Design a protein around this ligand. Sequence first.
Ligand SMILES: *[C@@H]1O[C@H](CO)[C@@H](O)[C@H](O)[C@H]1NC(C)=O
Ligand SMILES: [Mg+2]
Length: 112
Amino acid sequence: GSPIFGPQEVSSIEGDSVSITCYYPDTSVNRHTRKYWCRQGASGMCTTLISSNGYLSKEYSGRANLINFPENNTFVINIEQLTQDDTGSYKCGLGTGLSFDVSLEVSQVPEL
Ligand SMILES: *[C@@H]1O[C@H](CO)[C@@H](O)[C@H](O)[C@H]1NC(C)=O
Ligand SMILES: [Mg+2]
């Protein structure tokens, strides 16, 4: 099935911020479980970059937040100071399991 939903593709420009909302099923277990944002890598693993246990990758020091909103069965990942190096294939999810694939594209600032 389709337990998690979010934005399939997120397009931004260098310097921008994004706010990515992931939706989960309306259950107590899901409201209180670990939430995560991870980047899919060439090895096949999805490396956690931020989680609701308070974990943060050094790649996101000073520029990211993950906020759980149990009151509407969502959580939000905020990512700031984007650069082209943030382009990639990500997942938002619950647990370690339930997840949704997000493609983030960060393009160059257009020439004037
Ligand atoms: C969920 O609730 C939070 C807190 O009130 C709100 O800021 C956010 O917009 C809501 N999310 C959605 C998808 O309605
Ligand atoms: Mg590009």
